Q: What sequence folds into this?
């Protein structure tokens, strides 16, 4: 069996191995420095450390049989997977994480879990879980503040244990700076030890600093180093939250910059205020209906196969019901749905009046148009979704009775989203299909000689 | 004083704006200082009155003898006649604030006695401080130093106002009444400024507020100090991110090119040449491309910058001596700047010829010896070579000699293809160039 | 019957009228739930305000039952379809949960627990809708963003003040040095003192100043470490929001200063003479100071072609119809020609055109003043002003012309001109679809030249 | 010998001169202010100051013979280097850094090392070393946070020395704010002197301020000035770390903006969810395989010489293996590897089907294609890396029975990175080579009349 890393089973294993790594970091520094968790709940930590090492040897078995990409294909033979794993420096960190330092439990007698700090060497599975969760989730900023909160809680916890170990090494209650005398039953509880050390490290590493001041030189030096580490921690939190806030409303700032630039253009060029409130109402519609991005530059970073497949999946079954394109070739229709252009029309906007040059074909999507009667509000017929017009104006039939004119006044009743096939885009799509061009011209000539040629 | 003041090329107007800025900063600092602190005593009132009379003379000489004489632009053309400049000053929104500034409320010194709050309307002349800010931002080459100086001066001014408002709250609660108020021991302004510094930076370490007015004061002052510290960090972030935007953009594009070359296993000689190009392009241009800078400019400033750099060089060319000047201007606009490394070939012996090279800030060497490496001609900056290659068609011109770059040579390049795309608009100069090709070739 | 448009202004007036009791319900319901002298001492006031808030809440559910939505770009106006679309919405469950009568539990406890009205806090979406409709609506987006940040952290600081007072009531007042002091003492027993010291405690804690007394118990130590981590997050969002506000206030000025720095680095690199350097820097400072710094082709590009065509009608059409050759053309040709018009800006002393130049442009003067100077230098013959035009017969390329698309004038800019350019290629591309107007233009230009010189 | 300033030797000298400059800054301010460092370890500072001064004289003779670029080439005329150094303002700071003020040691008796503060005037070599190090390294943000940590350590150290000198000038132990009484053997050690002064400056300059408050107005003025200097310095440094973090994840912000824009497009336009899963899987591949930037924009600013060298270092051995591009000229192959355009294909993506318009020639790089059958996937030929197809589709020889059709169902087995030489790019690159164009038409006519053509 070969697990490939892009799957969901690899992510479920990344969760199942990120649990004992975070357990190893957090509770191994707490059991190393606090010395009553290790004494009291000893069989609980033996069961949890045994299950964590079972998950660690299962992780080195999974990393021996996980896939990788050469030439775009996932490698599926276990000999090459094991050779690619054993030539990696991550295999050295995994086998250094799996050394039995618990044999040192036979010498020092199980109260020293600092021998298991080699189990902290598998940090990369936790970082890989955070990266894969940051890609897989749909709340990246909420996960990023949760990950930053988890990182600074790890540093607050580690500095709590480091302060308790320094106050144990100097001596409990010998100074005003250190943790108090643990022979007193108020300070001697494990709850009071951990929660006051967490309070100390949170007052020190967030630069608030109302702790009792140091008296000895080691305590002064540790508080200087811990204050500089806390200043860098506060700068890291401020920079991460500030960049995340600037990423959360980059689209709102860019759209407000576009709105203010077009507003400065409209007060500079002395546009009349009916058109100014029409442009402001269209921008209010564009932000309220979440169509704020332009699809021409949205679909640019995709490759041409995915752009062509997306243009097939939106436009091609709508284009196949167009009466000139009912029997065209398939690659011609792929080129034509790549040549389609979206346009949004306001209510009351004329798509075409009677007598304009017909050089585009409009396919109605998400709209309702009306063939109004000669600068009037009276309507002959209403068009709907999926309909089309202007199809014979772009074909350029020789001897047309109309002569590429519209012969219809068409207004938009509500907000429309029409798809525009221009005449020049149709001709450059019909460059490499000349027989389809002759079939299109003959079909348009047949429709016109049915009506008026 | 000159019948007209340019206000852009005039440095004496910048000195006058410094004088009105000194008078305005005198008002905005020393009106709460005289208003709250007891420094305006009866044996000191002559110095304060002399300084206020000097600041009001500076305010009046601005309104009567300087600011009517300022030039401006009305519909494009520059206005220089004095009555129209005076009418433009009188119909401004500056003049309403200035005549509301010097409204003489000092005649209420007779009724209500001496009070510095009557001169508080003199703090409405902020527009001269903002014009001095704008002119000193414009005259400075590195304006982020003045942004840091302005942020520091705004911080010291808000700390001055916070020291004055704390000394007012100390005299309102009584000096030495509670533990939180100013006790009256040392200097008044220095210890109230110490309290304002430890409050508005949210340092703390002060005595705790005792009564309810002091808790409301410490609450609002700590909240305002949180927002002052936040605006200070945001101003320094904006100054650093705007100052190092071009360097970090250049480094991001260089690391993108380095990651692309490491993705495709391109050898380290080619990567060393690409890194040498990026280093010399940062050391010389301080930008990646001049083309994407120049394409955002309008066409007239593009034509002026193209004329002042290369039009004398192309008017030295005997091939384009006979041509019309508009086609020369379009080939000035369509020149492309390429940087050649030391030892790089701009012309290999036997390769195809398609380009005309205008060397600026470099040297190329025409290797034409018997063995092929003796330097025949060294072409310095301002030379044009390979211009006859633009007229041959098809295969046409092959380069007859090796031309290598001596050092870093910044060539300007006009292709045959872009010359033909220019010459489809100009048939007469095309006829002159083709008859010169038929004569010389 | 009556259907309110959600894009209208009456819907925004209702967003204000429903964002008032929602913010009231949040702020004063946690204050009355945790402070217990506001609830007891002001009972008829909160009965009047809670009856007014519930009247506004049932009017909100009848307004949301009669508000429109867009299908096919049209506003739905039948109340049965609006009521079914409201009934199949998750906001309807929050609205009827906001109108669940838990006030009968307010009847049985003796009107001293307003904790039962916390289902009234389930209409936060109307407050968020008022805030984002205000930030799109108003003219001060940065000032509203810092006001919204101040209001959000004031709600959080107020909720933490009530949480600290409830924790101090649960532990006991004055039993410890960390809690709120003994309320039987008449200095600390005032409700003004209670609320102002709790708000002061949470502003010290939630902005990481920490001038509070230190905790003495494990629950107080745990609440203080949780409150300090929440406070360093709150201070990080405050610094990040004010930093993004400062970066959004001067984004355009920093973009223009980056353009000025790049132009100055280009002119220092290419050894541009200092006369042109001062001219170009003074020209760009003019274009910034007169609020015309933006490029028209990049500004108008995000607009659709109908709005771009109508904007080009509203600027250039009535000045293009004053051109003698474009006086009588078809209207769609004039719409395509004002779409083809491109702007150019000129400095003082800049030549628009000299004699013997190939005339491929038709300049229309706007916001400028030109001068037909002689060949030796500046000597005015005709001073061209706003609304005027020249160079149309040069782009009309009349057959057998004695001028032969030349300029026949040296035209300099007196001040700062902003001309509109119609190229010869743009005229011919607009004249592809109009052959009849092309032959009418050529015959009109030929008749003008035959009247003058042909 | 003339030292080139862009060498490795010049950076080794920049390290060897940035060591005594940082030595002079740090250790000269604590020897000037602390007075037990200067009195106790005196011969150590005499040896270190003699080594720093002989490094300073070696620095001025290196700067007298260092190169500078004029017209793109390095000047090696040593008289020109000496005159260009002599007209520089760095030479004045160097000769003021090397005046013998240690002869002033003869009067004051060597306990006053503040006469060597002119030796602090060579700060430009330390700033030049930091600039060349962050230009040279491959961890620029790690060196920038390390440089900010070194700047706060120099500022905390200098403020510690300034606070100890102010406590010595006011008097030790006279106030609750100053450093305590040094005759007491607890406070009289040099370690507690430096470490408590460092503690005072770390508490004061970071605006935490848990020191004892001032009692005199000189101390109030110094603590106000020091709080202001500290809030300006640390607001600058927190803004610098914020700008550096915002430029560290700018590319992930741009890629997430592109992903969320294409996601909102696909939920807006009602695209089916199998294709939406294919697009999201391609974006997951593109982020997980570090291929987010694109070749056309990362090679947009380079000239065609270096783009030509980059492209012949990947494409030329594949392009020389093509049957029509076998014996072409070298400059034509340089133009053709400049004309190549990359396309990436998912697994199962059809490159071309039977009956498509053939106008591109695909060069396969990092991929495996398969010439499958029409109805099902029966792989006839599995094309590998370095292979090619469709050159007859871009030659368009007269009288072909294909008629620019593809005649093959070619779909990708895995992810492929194909490079496309279109017909328009080939016919544009052949405009300077008509003889090679006729050779290409004759070679394609040779292939097609070995297989299938009509004489038209
Ligand atoms: C801690 O307490 C025990 C007994 O309560 C006492 O013997 C010991 O000296 C104390 N430790 C210190 C450092 O005071
Ligand atoms: C509060 O004050 C009253 C009277 O002043 C006293 O009886 C009571 O014990 C005090 N409670 C506490 C907790 O101090
Ligand atoms: C410092 O200590 C010495 C002796 O221990 C004493 O004479 C001197 O007065 C002290 N200095 C101060 C300022 O108290
Ligand atoms: Na603080």
A:
């Amino acid at each position: 069996i070969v697990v490939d890393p892009s799957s969901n089973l690899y992510y479920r294993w990344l969760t199942a191995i990120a649990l004992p790594v975070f357990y190893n970091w957090y509770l191994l520094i707490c059991r190393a420095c606090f010395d009553e968790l290790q004494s009291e709940y000893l069989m609980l930590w033996l069961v949890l450390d045994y299950s964590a090492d079972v998950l660690y040897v299962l992780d080195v078995l999974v990393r021996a049989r996980t896939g990788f990409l050469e030439q775009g294909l996932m490698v599926s033979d276990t000999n090459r997977l094991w050779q690619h794993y054993k030539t990696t420096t991550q295999f050295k960190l995994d086998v250094l994480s799996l050394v039995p330092t618990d044999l040192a439990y036979l010498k020092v007698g199980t109260n020293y879990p600092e021998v298991r700090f080699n189990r902290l060497l598998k940090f990369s599975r936790l970082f890989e879980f955070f990266d894969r969760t940051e890609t897989r989730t749909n709340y990246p900023n909420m996960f990023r503040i949760g990950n930053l909160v988890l990182y600074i809680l790890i540093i607050i916890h580690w500095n709590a244990c480091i302060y308790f170990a320094i106050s144990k090494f100097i001596g409990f209650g010998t100074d005003s700076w250190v943790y108090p005398n643990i022979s007193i039953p108020e300070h001697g509880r494990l709850s009071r030890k951990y929660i006051y050390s967490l309070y100390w490290s949170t007052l020190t590493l967030t630069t608030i600093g109302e702790t009792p001041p140091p008296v000895k030189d080691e305590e002064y030096l540790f508080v200087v180093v811990d204050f500089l580490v806390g200043v860098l921690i506060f700068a890291t939190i401020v920079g991460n939250v500030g960049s995340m806030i600037s990423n959360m409303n980059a689209s709102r700032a860019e759209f407000q910059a576009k709105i203010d630039s077009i507003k400065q253009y409209m007060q500079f060029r002395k546009v009349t205020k009916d058109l100014e409130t029409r442009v402001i109402r269209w921008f209010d519609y564009l932000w309220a209906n979440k169509k704020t991005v332009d699809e021409k530059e949205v679909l640019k970073s995709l490759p041409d196969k995915l752009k062509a497949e997306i243009a097939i999946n939106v436009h091609l079954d709508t284009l196949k019901k167009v009466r000139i394109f009912q029997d065209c070739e398939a690659g011609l229709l792929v080129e034509l749905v790549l040549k389609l252009r979206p346009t949004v029309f306001s209510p009351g906007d004329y798509i075409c009046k009677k007598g304009d040059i017909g050089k585009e074909m409009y396919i109605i999507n998400e709209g309702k148009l009306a063939v109004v009667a000669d600068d009037g509000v009276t309507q002959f017929v209403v068009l709907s979704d999926g309909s089309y017009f202007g199809e014979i104006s772009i074909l350029n039939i020789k001897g047309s009775k109309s002569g590429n004119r519209r012969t219809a006044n068409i207004r938009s009743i509500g907000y429309s989203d029409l798809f525009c096939l221009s005449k020049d885009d149709l001709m450059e799509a019909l460059t490499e299909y000349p027989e389809a061009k002759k079939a299109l011209e003959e079909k348009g000539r047949q429709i016109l000689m049915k009506d008026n040629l | 004083l000159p019948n007209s003041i340019d206000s852009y090329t005039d440095r004496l107007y910048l000195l006058w704006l410094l004088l009105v800025t000194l008078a305005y900063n005198w008002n905005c600092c020393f009106i709460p200082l005289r208003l709250v602190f007891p420094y305006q005593t009866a044996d000191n009132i002559h110095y304060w009155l002399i300084a206020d009379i000097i600041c009001d003379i500076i305010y009046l000489y601005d309104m009567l003898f300087i600011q009517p004489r300022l030039q401006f632009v009305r519909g494009g053309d520059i206005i220089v006649d004095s009555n129209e400049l005076r009418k433009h000053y009188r119909t401004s929104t500056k003049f309403q604030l200035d005549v509301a500034s010097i409204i003489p409320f000092d005649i209420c010194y007779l009724f209500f006695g001496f009070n510095p709050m009557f001169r508080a309307n003199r703090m409405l002349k902020y527009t001269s401080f903002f014009e001095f800010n704008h002119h000193l931002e414009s005259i400075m080459d590195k304006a982020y130093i003045y942004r840091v100086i302005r942020t520091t001066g705004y911080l010291l001014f808000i700390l001055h106002i916070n020291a004055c408002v704390y000394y007012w709250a100390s005299n309102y609660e009584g000096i030495g009444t509670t533990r939180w108020v100013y006790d009256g021991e040392g200097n008044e302004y220095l210890r109230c400024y110490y309290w304002a510094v430890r409050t508005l930076i949210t340092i703390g370490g002060l005595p705790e507020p005792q009564t309810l007015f002091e808790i409301v004061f410490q609450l609002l002052n700590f909240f305002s100090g949180v927002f002052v510290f936040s605006s200070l960090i945001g101003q320094m972030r904006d100054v650093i991110g705007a100052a190092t935007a071009n360097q970090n953009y250049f480094r991001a594009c260089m690391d993108d090119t380095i990651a692309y070359m490491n993705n495709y296993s391109i050898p380290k000689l080619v990567q060393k040449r690409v890194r040498t190009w990026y280093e010399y392009t940062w050391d010389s241009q301080r930008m990646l491309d001049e083309s994407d800078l120049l394409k955002t400019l309008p066409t007239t400033v593009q034509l002026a910058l193209a004329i002042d750099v290369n039009f004398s060089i192309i008017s030295k060319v005997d091939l384009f001596k006979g041509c019309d000047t508009q086609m020369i201007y379009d080939m000035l606009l369509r020149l492309k700047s390429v940087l050649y490394l030391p030892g790089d070939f701009v012309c290999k012996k036997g390769e195809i010829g398609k380009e005309m090279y205008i060397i600026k800030h470099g040297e190329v060497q025409v290797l034409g010896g018997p063995d092929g490496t003796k330097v025949l001609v060294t072409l310095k900056a301002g030379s044009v070579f390979g211009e006859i290659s633009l007229l041959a068609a098809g295969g046409g011109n092959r380069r007859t000699a090796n031309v290598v770059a001596h050092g870093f040579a910044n060539l300007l390049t006009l292709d045959k293809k872009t010359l033909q795309e220019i010459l489809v608009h100009y048939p007469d100069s095309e006829r002159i160039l083709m008859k010169k090709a038929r004569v010389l070739l």
